[PDB]
Design an enzyme around this catalytic site. Structure first.
Site, PDB file in Angstrom:
ATOM      1  CE  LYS A   1       5.761   1.174  11.143  1.00  0.00           C
ATOM      2  NZ  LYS A   1       5.740   1.959  12.410  1.00  0.00           N
TER       3      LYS A   1
ATOM      4  CD  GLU B   1       9.239   1.567  -0.134  1.00  0.00           C
ATOM      5  OE1 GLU B   1      10.184   1.230   0.619  1.00  0.00           O
ATOM      6  OE2 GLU B   1       9.196   1.279  -1.351  1.00  0.00           O
ATOM      7  N   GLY B   2       8.055   4.256   3.085  1.00  0.00           N
ATOM      8  CA  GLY B   2       8.615   5.365   3.844  1.00  0.00           C
ATOM      9  C   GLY B   2       9.202   4.941   5.173  1.00  0.00           C
TER      10      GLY B   2
ATOM     11  CG  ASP C   1       2.677   9.774  13.135  1.00  0.00           C
ATOM     12  OD1 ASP C   1       3.264   9.755  12.024  1.00  0.00           O
ATOM     13  OD2 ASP C   1       3.139  10.342  14.153  1.00  0.00           O
TER      14      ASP C   1
ATOM     15  CG  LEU D   1      -2.044  -1.098   1.216  1.00  0.00           C
ATOM     16  CD1 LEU D   1      -2.770  -1.122   2.568  1.00  0.00           C
ATOM     17  CD2 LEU D   1      -3.061  -0.933   0.083  1.00  0.00           C
TER      18      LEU D   1
ATOM     19  CG  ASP E   1       3.648  14.652  11.124  1.00  0.00           C
ATOM     20  OD1 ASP E   1       3.335  15.764  10.616  1.00  0.00           O
ATOM     21  OD2 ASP E   1       4.147  13.718  10.466  1.00  0.00           O
TER      22      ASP E   1
ATOM     23  NE  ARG F   1       2.528  15.417   5.881  1.00  0.00           N
ATOM     24  CZ  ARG F   1       2.977  15.395   7.128  1.00  0.00           C
ATOM     25  NH1 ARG F   1       3.164  14.239   7.747  1.00  0.00           N
ATOM     26  NH2 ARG F   1       3.235  16.525   7.769  1.00  0.00           N
ATOM     27  CG  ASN F   2       0.542  11.444   9.424  1.00  0.00           C
ATOM     28  OD1 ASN F   2       1.001  10.511   8.732  1.00  0.00           O
ATOM     29  ND2 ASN F   2       1.350  12.334  10.015  1.00  0.00           N
TER      30      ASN F   2
HETATM   31  C1  LIG Z   1      -1.605   5.330   3.905  1.00  0.00           C
HETATM   32  C2  LIG Z   1      -1.416   3.832   3.841  1.00  0.00           C
HETATM   33  C3  LIG Z   1      -0.004   3.380   3.509  1.00  0.00           C
HETATM   34  N1  LIG Z   1      -1.924   3.231   5.123  1.00  0.00           N
HETATM   35  C4  LIG Z   1      -1.382   3.216   6.371  1.00  0.00           C
HETATM   36  C5  LIG Z   1      -2.222   2.485   7.262  1.00  0.00           C
HETATM   37  C6  LIG Z   1      -2.010   2.367   8.716  1.00  0.00           C
HETATM   38  O1  LIG Z   1      -2.989   2.224   9.421  1.00  0.00           O
HETATM   39  C7  LIG Z   1      -0.685   2.540   9.313  1.00  0.00           C
HETATM   40  C8  LIG Z   1       0.535   2.480   8.596  1.00  0.00           C
HETATM   41  N2  LIG Z   1       1.732   2.572   9.210  1.00  0.00           N
HETATM   42  C9  LIG Z   1       1.830   2.929  10.524  1.00  0.00           C
HETATM   43  C10 LIG Z   1       0.642   3.098  11.267  1.00  0.00           C
HETATM   44  N3  LIG Z   1       0.800   3.528  12.604  1.00  0.00           N
HETATM   45  C11 LIG Z   1       0.005   4.511  13.149  1.00  0.00           C
HETATM   46  O2  LIG Z   1      -0.923   5.060  12.548  1.00  0.00           O
HETATM   47  C12 LIG Z   1       0.396   4.845  14.588  1.00  0.00           C
HETATM   48  C13 LIG Z   1      -0.554   5.813  15.266  1.00  0.00           C
HETATM   49  C14 LIG Z   1      -1.925   5.555  15.359  1.00  0.00           C
HETATM   50  C15 LIG Z   1      -2.773   6.513  15.981  1.00  0.00           C
HETATM   51  C16 LIG Z   1      -2.160   7.679  16.485  1.00  0.00           C
HETATM   52 CL1  LIG Z   1      -3.196   8.880  17.212  1.00  0.00          CL
HETATM   53  C17 LIG Z   1      -0.807   7.934  16.383  1.00  0.00           C
HETATM   54  C18 LIG Z   1       0.040   6.959  15.769  1.00  0.00           C
HETATM   55  C19 LIG Z   1      -0.569   2.788  10.687  1.00  0.00           C
HETATM   56  C20 LIG Z   1      -3.408   2.172   6.457  1.00  0.00           C
HETATM   57  C21 LIG Z   1      -4.633   1.540   6.710  1.00  0.00           C
HETATM   58  N4  LIG Z   1      -4.980   1.129   7.954  1.00  0.00           N
HETATM   59  N5  LIG Z   1      -5.499   1.361   5.652  1.00  0.00           N
HETATM   60  C22 LIG Z   1      -5.168   1.778   4.409  1.00  0.00           C
HETATM   61  N6  LIG Z   1      -4.018   2.430   4.141  1.00  0.00           N
HETATM   62  C23 LIG Z   1      -3.135   2.629   5.120  1.00  0.00           C
END
Ligand SMILES: CC(C)n1cc(C(=O)c2cncc(NC(=O)Cc3ccc(Cl)cc3)c2)c2c(N)ncnc21
Length: 277
Positions: free
Chosen positions: A56, A30-31, A170, A28, A152, A156-157
């Site tokens: 992840k 990286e980074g 995030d 889906l 952050d 985008r988050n």
């Molecule tokens: C955009 C694409 C690539 N994508 C990422 C998905 C993820 O859910 C995801 C990816 N990597 C790391 C995390 N970690 C966090 O979010 C940690 C966090 C949670 C809450 C708060 Cl307040 C603070 C920090 C999560 C995702 C997904 N679930 N569905 C579709 N695309 C996704």
């Protein structure tokens, strides 16, 4: 890494998922450490045989990153809200280490805004933009209640799911979203998060344009430190720009509270104001 969250002490253990219960589909994105995959997950919810999840995969071994992984997983397990990305648990059997989240089918909110600019395709209406903003604000009210500082917040988050449900996550300095005290003194608080929320409101109302897009990274740092405010977007009604200005007060203690910002956005989303650019 998670030192700023030390006051948050987890109640319980993280949910563990067997490796063989995760079936990877495709990447889906990286980074940040590292890749994110769409996957099927078995035996997670009792009524459904399999369901889609985002996984992840941690890159490092390390063993400093393994301690950071357990700490992060314990913190994510604590975050339970309708507008915060849902964390399902980890897979620690073998390598790589995996974190599992509820899959959000429409992906990140920045890309969603840019693709639905001037799921049902077409330009998002005022009511829809307000509904997106209200949901992100609801998530931020929850985080403030937990004394969780995001640091952050940006479109985008955020993620968009079925029925335009929006959730905060995030995914991995975001100077353009930061207030002067965060840029200058690395002071990250509930009040710097409310300033970033005002910038997220600006992103929503510009359909995902970058804040200070007319400026280089250096010029943007200088403009924020000097106190210049982002311009009112064309699609933004006066009532919504007043919310942005409330989030952007130079003095942190003068900024509006996220509870009030969320209540104002709820009121506008259930209306909305009669506004046409
Ligand atoms: C955009 C694409 C690539 N994508 C990422 C998905 C993820 O859910 C995801 C990816 N990597 C790391 C995390 N970690 C966090 O979010 C940690 C966090 C949670 C809450 C708060 Cl307040 C603070 C920090 C999560 C995702 C997904 N679930 N569905 C579709 N695309 C996704």
């Amino acid at each position: 890494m998670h030192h700023h969250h030390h006051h948050l002490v987890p109640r319980g253990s993280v949910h563990h998922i067997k490796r063989r219960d995760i079936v990877l589909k495709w990447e889906l994105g990286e980074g940040a450490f590292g890749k994110v995959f769409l996957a099927e997950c078995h035996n997670l919810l009792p009524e459904q045989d399999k369901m889609l999840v985002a996984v992840k995969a941690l890159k490092e071994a390390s063993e400093s990153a393994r301690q950071d992984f357990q700490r992060e997983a314990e913190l994510l397990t604590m975050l339970q809200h309708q507008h915060i990305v849902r964390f399902f648990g980890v897979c620690t059997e073998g390598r790589p280490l995996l974190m599992v989240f509820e899959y959000m089918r429409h992906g990140d909110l920045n890309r969603f805004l840019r693709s639905h600019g001037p799921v049902a395709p077409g330009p998002l209406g005022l009511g829809q933009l307000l509904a997106v903003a209200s949901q992100v604000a609801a998530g931020m009210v929850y985080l403030a209640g937990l004394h969780f500082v995001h640091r952050d917040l940006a479109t985008r988050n955020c993620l968009v799911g079925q029925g335009l449900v929006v959730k905060i996550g995030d995914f991995g300095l975001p100077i353009r979203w930061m207030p002067p005290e965060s840029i200058l003194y690395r002071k990250f608080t509930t009040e710097s998060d409310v300033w970033s929320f005002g910038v997220v409101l600006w992103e929503i109302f510009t359909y995902g344009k970058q804040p200070w897009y007319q400026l280089s990274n250096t010029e943007a740092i200088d403009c924020i430190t000097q106190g210049r405010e982002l311009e009112r977007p064309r699609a933004c009604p006066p009532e919504v720009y007043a919310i942005m200005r409330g989030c952007w007060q130079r003095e942190p203690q003068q900024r509006h509270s996220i509870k009030d910002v969320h209540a104002r956005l709820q009121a506008l989303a259930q209306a909305p104001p009669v506004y046409l650019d």
